[PDB]
């Protein structure tokens, strides 16, 4: 307990993923709420053995300082798709409320590729073409790992072994892109937070091509790495990608009791 009365608290909510779902947008928008304290970086507690072995005292020490009635949140997108994670989250807090943000599974693949491609292009390293990952022996490459991260039903089933359905709120990442404020209202509702966030905290930035955030005189967009142009992909290949996900999408829809407007 600091002189100002603040203290580090374990998170009362965690944004677990998906990788490229819009996790940083969700983290920054939720942290507009005066009752929310966000960790600025991805903590990687549950998913890295070298962090997790340090235990809960180490986790707590990575949290922002907050006041007792505030909710602390952390985002690490690797959580969702790491098999050992939900069991570790459950032994910290079986009752925790979790945030999962999902985009269209094909758009998420192209986003994931784009990000690693861009990490390479600036370090002046080579990177294969997306067709090199996506196509093997004239067929869609089902062993491309990005595709597995988009099989949401598989990862969701692993969380549902430990957490009840009603304690994982699914943010529609496609809708957050188009019109964030209604999705953010649902998050406040899920977390039982007063409606402090306003439509006026968001504005469309034409250069960015995405909404940016407005809060008591300060204007901020997400950084360079967020909202990057995906590669051009032949329509025939884009179509096969879309088709690949149709059946796993239906399995996901049946598991969570709702549908999403995906390709
Ligand atoms: N206001 C916003 N600004 C920038 N990106 C946003 C955004 N709202 C949602 N996003 C999505 O956040 C994605 C990145 O997700 P994460 O933060 O989990 O890595 C971006 O992927 P793209 O770069 O493919 O557009 C973008 O589509």
DSSP string, the chain: --TTS-EE---SEEE---TTSSHHHHHHHHTTSTTEEE-SS---TTT-HHHHTTHHHHHHHTSPEE-TTSEEEEE-GGGTT-TTHHHHHHHH-TT-EEEEEE--HHHHHHHHHHHHHHHHHHTT-----HHHHHEETTEE-TT-HHHHHT-HHHHHHHHHTTS-GGGEEEEEHHHHHH-HHHHHHHHHHHTT--S---GGGEEEETTTTEEEEEETTEEE---TTSSPPPPP--HHHHHHHHHHTHHHHHHHHHHHT------
86 vs 40: CA distance, rounded Å: 22
Centre of ligand 1 from the C-alpha of residue 11, in Å: 23
Experimental method: X-ray
Name residues whose C-beta falls within 8 Å of residue 207's C-beta, 6 or more positions apart in sequence.
none
15 vs 77: CA distance, rounded Å: 7
Ligand 1: which residue has its CA nearest to atom 12?
A: 22
State the CB neighbour count (10 A cutoff) for residue 144: 19
C-alpha distances out from residue 261 to 55, 174, 175, 193, 247, Å: 40, 9, 9, 27, 14
Cβ proximity of 187 and 99 under 8 Å: yes
* Residue 5: both structure tokens together: 């009365």
158 vs 155: CA distance, rounded Å: 5
Place of tokens 């994931």: 112
Domains of the chain in start order, with CATH, are 1-263 (3.40.50.300)
For ligand 1, residues with CB inside 6 Å are 20-25, 77, 111, 114, 176-177, 210-211, 222, 226-228
Which atom of ligand 1 is nearest to 29's Cα?
Answer: 1
256 vs 103: CA distance, rounded Å: 15
149 marked among binding-site residues: no
Centre of ligand 1 from the C-alpha of residue 237, in Å: 23
Centre of ligand 1 from the C-alpha of residue 108, in Å: 10
Which atom of ligand 1 is nearest to 27's Cα?
Answer: 17
Centre of ligand 1 from the C-alpha of residue 1, in Å: 36
Ligand 1: which residue has its CA nearest to atom 21?
A: 227
Ligand 1: which residue has its CA nearest to atom 22?
A: 227
Ligand 1: which residue has its CA nearest to atom 11?
A: 22
95 phi, psi to nearest 5 deg? -95, 0
Centre of ligand 1 from the C-alpha of residue 25, in Å: 6
Cβ proximity of 73 and 80 under 8 Å: no
Q: Which of 20, 128, 6, 152 is nearest to 75 (CA)?
A: 20
Which atom of ligand 1 is nearest to 211's Cα?
Answer: 1
240 vs 101: CA distance, rounded Å: 24
Burial class (CB in 10 A: 0-12, 13-18, 19+), 258: exposed
Cβ proximity of 73 and 12 under 8 Å: yes
211 marked among binding-site residues: yes
Strand partners, 262: none
State the greatest distance between any 2 C-alpha atoms of the chain, in Å, as a whole number: 65
């Amino acid at each position: 307990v600091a002189p100002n009365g603040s203290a580090q608290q374990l998170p009362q909510t965690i944004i677990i993923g998906v990788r490229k779902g819009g996790t940083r947008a969700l983290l920054e928008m939720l942290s507009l709420h005066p009752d929310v304290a966000a960790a600025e970086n991805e903590v990687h507690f549950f998913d890295w053995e070298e962090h997790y072995s340090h235990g809960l005292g180490w986790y707590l020490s990575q949290m922002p300082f907050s006041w007792p009635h505030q909710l602390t949140v952390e985002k690490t997108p690797a959580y969702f798709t790491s098999p050992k994670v939900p069991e570790r989250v459950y032994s910290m807090n079986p009752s925790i409320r979790l945030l999962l943000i999902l985009r269209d599974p094909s758009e998420r693949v192209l986003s994931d590729y784009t990000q690693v491609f861009y990490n390479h292009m600036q370090k002046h390293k080579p990177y294969p073409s997306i067709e090199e990952f996506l196509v093997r022996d004239g067929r869609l490459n089902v062993d491309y790992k990005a595709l597995n991260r988009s099989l949401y039903h598989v990862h969701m089933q692993n969380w549902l072994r430990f957490f009840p359905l009603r304690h994982i709120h699914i943010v529609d990442g496609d809708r957050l892109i188009r019109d964030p404020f209604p999705e953010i209202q649902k998050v406040e509702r899920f977390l039982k937070l007063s409606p402090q966030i306003n439509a006026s905290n968001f504005y469309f930035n034409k250069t960015k091509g995405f909404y940016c955030l407005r809060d008591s005189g300060r204007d901020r967009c997400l950084h360079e790495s967020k909202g990057r142009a995906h590669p051009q992909v032949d329509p025939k290949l884009l179509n096969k990608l879309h088709e690949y996900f149709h059946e796993p999408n239906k399995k996901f829809f049946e598991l969570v009791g709702r549908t999403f407007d995906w390709h």
